C-alpha cells in the first residue's frame, strides 16, 4: 500500500539517477508485490552483483551500479527517518515543506560557517551534532555541531544572519510552516 507507493518513488528516482550515463523489480513494485523493505534491498543487492559480474568489477557499468545501489540504500534510510517527509519530498505539492509531520520536527536556527544562522528542521541527532534540513530553495541537508544550534524561539534579530534573497524566502517558508503547525493543517 504505502510501501508500494514509496518503492515506486525509489524505482523512479533511481532510473533518473541511472542516467549517470530490473523490469522484474519494476514489475514487482508496480504490482505491489514487495512485502518488506529488506526484501526490496536484497533484490537491489542481487541486481548489483549480477551487474558487476556481467560487465567486470572495474567497468564503467560497475561504477554506476555501485553508485545506484548506494543511492537506493540512501532512499531507504531517508524513508525510515520520516515517511511523511519522504512522501512530500517526492510528490511535492505547493508548500510541501510547510506541512507538519507526526511527530513534529524540532525547529532550529542552524549556523554553518560563512552563512550565518538559517532556519531548519531537525531530522535526527546525536550528542555532538544534528542532521538538519534547511528551509528555502533547494532544501539542503547538513550535519550541524550542537553548539551551532539555537531553538527557533529566539528572535532572529539577536542572531548573526546574512539577509540574502534566499534567506528571506527561507524565513517566509518557516513562518508558513509554523502557521500550518498551529492550524493543524496536515497534507491530505
Amino acid at each position: 500500500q504505502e510501501m508500494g507507493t514509496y518503492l515506486r518513488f525509489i524505482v523512479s528516482r533511481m532510473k533518473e539517477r541511472a542516467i549517470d550515463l530490473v523490469p522484474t523489480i519494476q514489475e514487482k513494485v508496480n504490482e505491489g508485490k514487495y512485502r518488506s523493505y529488506e526484501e526490496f534491498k536484497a533484490d537491489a543487492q542481487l541486481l548489483l552483483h549480477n551487474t558487476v559480474i556481467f560487465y567486470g568489477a572495474a567497468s564503467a557499468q560497475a561504477d554506476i551500479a555501485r553508485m545506484l545501489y548506494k543511492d537506493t540504500c540512501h532512499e531507504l534510510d531517508e524513508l525510515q527517518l520520516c515517511k511523511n517527509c519522504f512522501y512530500l519530498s517526492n510528490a511535492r505539492p505547493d508548500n510541501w515543506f510547510c506541512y507538519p509531520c507526526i511527530p513534529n520536527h524540532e525547529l532550529v536556527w542552524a549556523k554553518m560557517k560563512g552563512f550565518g544562522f538559517w532556519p531548519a528542521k531537525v531530522m535526527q541527532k546525536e550528542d555532538n551534532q544534528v542532521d538538519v534540513r534547511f528551509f528555502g530553495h533547494h532544501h539542503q541537508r547538513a550535519w550541524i555541531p550542537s553548539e551551532n544550534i539555537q531553538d527557533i524561539t529566539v528572535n532572529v534579530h539577536r542572531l548573526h544572519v546574512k539577509r540574502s534573497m534566499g534567506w528571506k524566502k527561507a524565513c517566509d517558508e518557516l513562518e508558513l510552516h509554523q502557521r500550518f503547525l498551529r492550524e493543524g493543517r496536515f497534507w491530505k
Binding site: R13, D71, E78, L81, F86, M112, K113, R133, H138, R141
Partner: peptide
C-alpha cells in the same frame, strides 16, 4: 540530488 535533499556545501 536526492528528493529529500542533497548535502549543503561548506562556504
Amino acid at each position: 540530488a536526492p528528493a529529500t535533499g542533497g548535502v549543503k556545501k561548506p562556504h
